[PDB]
Amino acid sequence: PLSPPTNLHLEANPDTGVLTVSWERSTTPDITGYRITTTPTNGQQGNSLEEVVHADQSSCTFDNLSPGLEYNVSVYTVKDDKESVPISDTIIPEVPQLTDLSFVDITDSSIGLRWTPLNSSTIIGYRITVVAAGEGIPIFEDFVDSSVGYYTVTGLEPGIDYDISVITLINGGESAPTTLTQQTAVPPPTDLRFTNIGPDTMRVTWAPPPSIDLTNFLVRYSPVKNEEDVAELSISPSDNAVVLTNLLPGTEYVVSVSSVYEQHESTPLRGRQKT
């Protein structure tokens, strides 16, 4: 008989939407080519496709199969007007996941999300989940339609890591989750102030971030000329000022104040002052 193909392999790439069918070529010496078919196993869903390749080829592609449907794939060895018994297998192509989820407009209580909505016509929406990374506590869940690629998560706490996921949805299935960790901002102090200036000392003052309970403030300072010479002070969250001692006369210093919650610190508030 005409010997069928062997070693049938089916690879559905969800990012490209393409099914690649491969096989080991027939042992029969003088063949025309191969005929490959695509047939949904659920008789109420999808439709059939057919592909044809040359005798020296051992793969073919099919695009625009429906994610989440089961398909029987058959490969037939072709010899003029004659065909081998097929080799067959089933595959369920995955739902595509988002590949460019990014974060934007990060604040102390809010996180903005952006992504490119996928171009797959059976996608009917996205699921957004927000989980507190430290404890695995679910925080928030919502749904957006298939054409939306933006979302603002609100009502969060500052200085906290959140696992944020966007899952692509079809009727009756979903993609693997696109999950990323994003920390909420620790709010910086504002309005750096320098008073009581002497040869060796200076009073550093700032405005605390409102309505937050910091672990501490963290004061860093170093000479402008040699900036690898950094000293570090830990200040109580209830204090808005510190007196810096043991300084050099006629010298310009860079000073930063950073809010700190649970080891996570704010962007620095920075200013220069000359003794």
Partner: protein
Amino acid sequence: SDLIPAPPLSKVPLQQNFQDNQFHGKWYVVGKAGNHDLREDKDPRKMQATIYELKEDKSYNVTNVRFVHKKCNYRIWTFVPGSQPGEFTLGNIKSWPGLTSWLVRVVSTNYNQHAMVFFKRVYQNRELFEITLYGRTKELTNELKENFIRFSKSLGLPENHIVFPVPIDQCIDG
């Protein structure tokens, strides 16, 4: 980072003949113990409240209430009845990526005074568990608090993993 292994469930009893309609309402968090390392902020912990609303489908609308960073913070979960009365899991657990397991079990209560609740979950292949001593008021008997300590220790948790939060007035009453 490091975790005390979860106790086998043979070690966690279940309140017999649990009455969902009597567990209903506000419970204050008088004591709590967990398997995660506790960082001390240079601050004692403030008391929280947890409200269990019973629904027509016999599930609970659970609302945790906290006074953190000078605001009121609310968090809501849906607890659905597990295999037995007194047991609960999370409605729609397959909604949450990486969260593969979630168990709540009412260890013991008298409904009008005190409760001990055991929570277990697996998130991203890490097993976390807690025990809460709940009270109908903000304070409980020494005997009861001692009982909770004794029970927590029986689950493998050391003394210093146990906290009794300080009673406060913000958020939790209103």
